Amino acid sequence: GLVPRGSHMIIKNYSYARQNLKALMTKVNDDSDMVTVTSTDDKNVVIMSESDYNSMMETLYLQQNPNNAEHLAQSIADLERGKTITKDIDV
Amino acid sequence: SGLVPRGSHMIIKNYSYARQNLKALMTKVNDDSDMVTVTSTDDKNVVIMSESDYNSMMETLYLQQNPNNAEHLAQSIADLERGKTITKDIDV
Amino acid sequence: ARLNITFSPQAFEDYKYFQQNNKKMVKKINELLKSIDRNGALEGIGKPEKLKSNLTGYYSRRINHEHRLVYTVDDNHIKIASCKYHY
Amino acid sequence: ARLNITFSPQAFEDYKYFQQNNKKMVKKINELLKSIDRNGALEGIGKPEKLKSNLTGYYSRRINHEHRLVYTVDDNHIKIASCKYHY
């Protein structure tokens, strides 16, 4: 399966996950790992930190329009290359 | 107001509820395309989704993350919808 | 086994390219199409998955670790949006 | 008041657009920038989130339901990649 960069997928079965649910919630939050909980009937789930979920949906939202995706790519490439505008602004 | 894929609904439950009803929640996210945010006293919360929806999200991300591939897909799906297509018998 | 397939213009160009220059890939694609025909859009080889966002209504199967067959099924007819990753 | 900000070319054009035509939006952006300055990249208003994929190293904050402030922080200096959604 596919996994975000810097993340690792952990596989656990259901009895285990329900016994150790709090420990798994800490694990995915602390180490940005994700847990596939397996079911005898293959009705499995993936558990991720709320932060990683929000990150994935935010990344999706920004990248999903090819024109916005290109605007972000070019702008981050500009910033890394010093191709920038520096302005003092007041709040 | 968090984000949620089309046709999905986010449900919020707390840790005690979720640990008692884990199996029912695993069924719910699989049957109805819903997702469950499980809260904790210390806000170290999680989101539970079906493995299928997970794979769908990562597959969608993979295909869309290169603007050129995303444009190729968008153009191609537009072509297919408008009948600007090539139909061929292929031996399989 | 004759199989009537509808291609997008760009997917056809890539299929034709694979036909001439990468036989193992056209073979794999043809196997995925056979599996879609017999088993339905969400069953068989290639790890079928539903796509979301603006790809809603389409599916992907793995040609290999890199390339995806992106397709849909309309009145029992297979339509191919893509069969090669574009950069 | 004074806060030194590094814009990308396109982010700056959009910032200047908002300046002439949408002062509601420039005010919000400026408040987000002040919050990043005081609280750090991941704390404060706008629901800060880390971005993934090719946006790794950058963050998002909400200007409104539609537009995002996409930014990063380098040796305590804020850099803006985007402040308006491009269609």
* Six-digit token string for D79: 């850099």
Structure token pair of residue B91: 């031996």
Instruction: Give residues with Cβ within 8 angstroms of C25, minimum separation 6.
Output: C18, C63, C64, C67
CA distances to A52, B5, B48, B84, B88 from A34, rounded to whole Å, are 9, 19, 10, 42, 43
**Tokens at D34, concatenated:** 């002040």
Please give the resolution of this entry in Å, rounded to 1 decimal: 1.7
Q: Do B39 and B72 fall within a single domain?
A: no
The domain total for chain D is 1
> What is the number of structural domains in chain B?
2
The whole-angstrom distance between B38's CA and the closest CA on chain A is 9
Domain, as residue range, for D81? 1-87
- Is B18 part of any domain? yes
- Is chain B touching chain C, with at least 3 CB–CB pairs below 8 Å? yes
Contact at CB, A59 and D53, closer than 8 angstroms: yes
For A62, the token pair is 């920004």
Q: What is the 3-state secondary structure (H, E, C) of D22-81?
A: CHHHHHHHHHHHHHHHHHCCCCCCCCCEECCHHHCCCEEEECCCCCEEEEEEECCEEEEE
How far from D20 is each of D23, D24, D27, D64, CA to CA, in Å? 7, 11, 12, 18
Element (DSSP H or E) covering residue A77: helix A66-80
Yes or no: say if C55 and B64 are a contact pair by the CB < 8 Å rule. Answer: yes
Residues of D in Cβ contact (< 8 Å) with B61:
53
- Do the domain assignments include residue B10? yes
Q: Rounded CA gap, B58 and A36, in Å?
A: 14
The answer to whether the beta carbons of residues C81 and C5 sit under 8 Å apart is: no
Cβ distance of B27 and A43 shorter than 8 Å: yes
The DSSP symbol for D8 reads: P
B43 shares its domain with B9: yes
Residue B29 lies inside a defined structural domain of this protein:
yes
User: Domain holding A2: CATH number?
Assistant: 3.40.1620.10
| B90, part of any domain | no
List the CATH number of the domain containing C23: 3.30.2310.20
B68 shares a domain with B30: no
Domain hosting residue A63, numbered range: 49-82
- C-alpha angle C47-C50-C51 in degrees, rounded to nearest 5: 115
Q: What is the CATH number of the domain that holds B59?
A: 6.10.250.330
A35 and A56 share a domain?
no
Q: Which of C74, C49, C77 is nearest to C61 (CA)?
A: C49
Residues A66 and A37 grouped into a single domain = no
Judge if A67 and A37 occupy the same domain.
no
SS (H, E, C) B12-52: EEEHHHHHHCHHHHHHHHHHHCCEEEEECCCCCCEEEEEHH
B65 and B25 both lie in a single domain? no
Is A87 inside any structural domain? no
Clarify whether residues B18 and B38 are in a common domain.
Answer: yes
Does residue A1 sit in the same domain as residue A36?
yes
Q: Which residues of B touch A43 (CB under 8 A)?
A: 26-27, 30, 50
Mutate to test the interface with D, among A71, A81, A88 (most CBs of D within 10 A): A71
A77 residue type, one letter: A
